[PDB]
Amino acid sequence: TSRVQPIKLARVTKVLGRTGSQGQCTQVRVEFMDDTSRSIIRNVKGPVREGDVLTLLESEREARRLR
C-alpha cells in the first residue's frame, strides 16, 4: 500500500432505488463535510434513512449497477 488513508465520514442526502442481484442493498447520494458541494453516490446495504452519516474507508468510488 505504502500509504495510509484517513477515515472519512460523510452524510447522505437523498435515497435512490434499491439495487443488487437479490436487492440486498440501497443506493444513496453521499455528501461530505470538507466541502459542502462534494456529493457522490455510493452503495450501502441495510436500513438507510435521509440524515444519518456513513463511515467511508475508501472515499473515491462511485456507485454500481446490477453487474
Partner 1 sequence: TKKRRNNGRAKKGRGHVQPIRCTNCACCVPKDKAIKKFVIRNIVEAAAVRDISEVSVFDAYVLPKLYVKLHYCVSCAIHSKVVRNRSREARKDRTPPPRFR
Partner 2 sequence: SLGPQVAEGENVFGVCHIFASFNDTFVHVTDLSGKETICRVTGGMKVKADRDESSPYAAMLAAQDVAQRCKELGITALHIKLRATGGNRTKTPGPGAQSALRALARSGMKIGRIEDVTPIPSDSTRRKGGRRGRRL
Partner RNA sequence: GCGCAAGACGGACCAGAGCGAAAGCAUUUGCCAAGAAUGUUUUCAUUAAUCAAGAACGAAAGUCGGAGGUUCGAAGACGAUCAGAUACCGUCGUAGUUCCGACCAUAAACGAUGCCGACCGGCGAUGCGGCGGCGUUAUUCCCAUGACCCGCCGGGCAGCUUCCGGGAAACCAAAGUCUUUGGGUUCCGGGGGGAGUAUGGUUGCAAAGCUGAAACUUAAAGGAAUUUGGCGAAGGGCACCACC
**Rounded to whole angstroms, how far apart are CA atoms 18 and 12?**
15
Stretch that binds RNA, among 4-12, 19-27, 30-38, 57-65 (CB under 7 A): 19-27
CB nearer to RNA: pick between 38 and 45:
45
With vertex at residue 44, the alpha carbon angle to CA 41 and CA 47, rounded to the nearest 5 degrees, is 125
**Shortest spacing between CB 35 and partner 1, in angstroms:** 10
Q: Which is nearer to RNA, 4 or 66 (CB)?
A: 66
2 touching partner 1, by CB under 8 A: no
Q: Burial of 44 by CB count in 10 Å (0-12 exposed, 13-18 middle, 19+ buried)?
A: middle
